[PDB]
């Protein structure tokens, strides 16, 4: 019945007291957090409260679109020794920090992912060379599907792979993907091992990395420049902005205190000092 | 079963969930989900591997977290034949899905490729 945009509990007028009631007294040993409102420890006037928790609702908290990855590609000359660089990226929020930390306050979740692609470009050589408006392809290769080998192989024919042809200089590309989780909720943390070391086997064959799983495996993105080789090398960056929408979460955890190090819960040394100096008896 | 009419037998086709030792002895495969099969007038049999998996769907690839298991066939007695009968024969297998079999998230296959 209570929604987000509802007014918080109205403060009630309270006066002098001398009773067998003990609001102020608790014992945090019970695990229970003592619920004390204003009209308890002090005499408060009647206040028709107006503040609402609207903007603090789960949906609202993650209501921004974060930068998950930067993918580099180019379009080098037909005469270059190197191959036309096409980008491949493992789909994950973890690569950066921000979006990750926010997703860390909870143990689990369900959310339809909405993606954004703000592509940029530029020349590289000190040549007054020309380049026509470039076309971009964003290709979603699910787990175990043909990942491209060249910038021009049968794979990009994508008879079944959902791709996005972006024409540079237009309103950024966008797609929506629902809950593709193999579970019931995507596990931001996972206490375990994909394999179980066995006894009539060898340490090699039953060794697995702690913390990982297939849960957080969804596929990779492959981006290229659909235009062929051009007389002037034109590099390009693909920024991916992800925004969780229609979100739910389960069981809170404390936010990441120290600086990140890897996709694991691991921490590097020298970054173990989160706080600063401040006296106990000084304001 | 594709052996003569005068040939007989009993076999133990089995299915054990994953996350343990792959069984190499009847005794172990016998400890799991199996269907003891008798060879007779009804030449074919069917063992149903019911869905017993951690997730709601498994990766179509070679991944451990979503690993499937182990299917194994073993002699429950042995093959018995009389005189004037071939001592060797063949058995064909046929895999299919049960009505509750479903799939999701379409992608491209790898079983074909256009090179050049």
């Amino acid at each position: 019945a209570a929604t987000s945009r509802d007014a918080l509990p109205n403060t009630e007028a309270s006066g002098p007291t001398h009773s067998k009631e003990i609001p102020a007294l608790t014992a945090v040993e019970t695990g229970a957090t003592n619920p004390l409102v204003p009209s308890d420890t002090v005499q408060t006037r009647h206040v028709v409260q107006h503040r609402s928790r609207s903007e603090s609702s789960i949906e609202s908290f993650f209501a921004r679109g974060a930068c998950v990855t930067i993918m580099t590609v180019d379009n080098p000359a037909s005469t270059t020794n190197k191959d036309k660089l096409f980008a491949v990226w493992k789909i994950t929020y973890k690569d950066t920090v921000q979006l990750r930390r926010k997703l860390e306050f909870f143990t689990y979740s369900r959310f339809d992912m909405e993606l954004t692609f703000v592509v940029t470009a530029n020349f590289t050589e000190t040549n007054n060379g020309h380049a026509l408006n470039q076309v971009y392809q964003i290709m979603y290769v699910p787990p175990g599907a043909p990942v491209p080998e060249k910038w021009d192989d049968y794979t990009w024919q994508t008879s079944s792979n959902p791709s996005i042809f972006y024409t540079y200089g237009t309103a950024p590309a966008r797609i929506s993907v629902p809950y593709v989780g193999i579970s019931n909720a995507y596990s931001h943390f996972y206490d375990g091992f994909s394999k179980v070391p066995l006894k009539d086997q060898s340490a090699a064959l039953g060794d697995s990395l702690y913390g990982a799983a297939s849960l957080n495996d969804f596929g990779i993105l492959a981006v290229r420049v659909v235009n062929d080789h051009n007389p002037t090398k034109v590099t390009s960056k693909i920024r991916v902005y992800l925004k969780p929408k229609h979100i739910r979460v389960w069981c809170p955890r404390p936010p990441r205190a120290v600086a990140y190090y890897g996709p694991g819960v691991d921490y590097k040394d020298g970054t173990l000092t989160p706080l600063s100096t401040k006296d106990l008896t000084t304001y | 079963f594709c052996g003569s009419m005068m040939a007989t037998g009993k076999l133990l086709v089995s299915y054990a969930p994953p996350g343990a030792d792959p069984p190499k002895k009847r005794k172990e495969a016998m400890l799991g989900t199996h269907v003891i099969w008798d060879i007779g007038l009804q030449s074919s049999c069917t063992m149903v591997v019911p869905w017993i998996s951690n997730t709601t769907y498994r990766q179509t690839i070679d991944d451990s977290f979503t690993e499937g298991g182990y299917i194994s066939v073993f002699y429950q007695t042995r093959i018995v034949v009389p005189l004037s009968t071939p001592r060797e024969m063949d058995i064909l297998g046929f895999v299919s899905a049960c009505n509750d079999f479903s799939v999701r998230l379409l992608r491209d296959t790898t079983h074909i490729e256009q090179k050049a």
Partner: nanobody
Amino acid sequence: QVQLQESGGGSVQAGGSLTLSCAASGITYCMGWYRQVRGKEREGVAFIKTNDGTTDYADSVKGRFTISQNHATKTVYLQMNSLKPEDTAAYYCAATWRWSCPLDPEGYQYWGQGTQVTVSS
């Protein structure tokens, strides 16, 4: 489009141990499946999956080598112990996302420059 680099390789005696480092460009493990293929010419040693576990070693070296993943630095190593003269080979590192093909040298797409290791008798 990752770029490999073979570092931490050199001369040592017989019986000892040496470590090999393989840092990479990107967006590293994103091309997935890092490897260690020795031989003066071409022959595998270690193979590894960027996700999950997921080790496996060449029968010829089994139980003396280990390939590890440092996803933070983007470096894949190779701890070679109890070295023996037959270990003096041309070491390299590899990758292909294709979650399979670890038994074919020509199945790869990425290769580094290399580092000669010498198990001096």
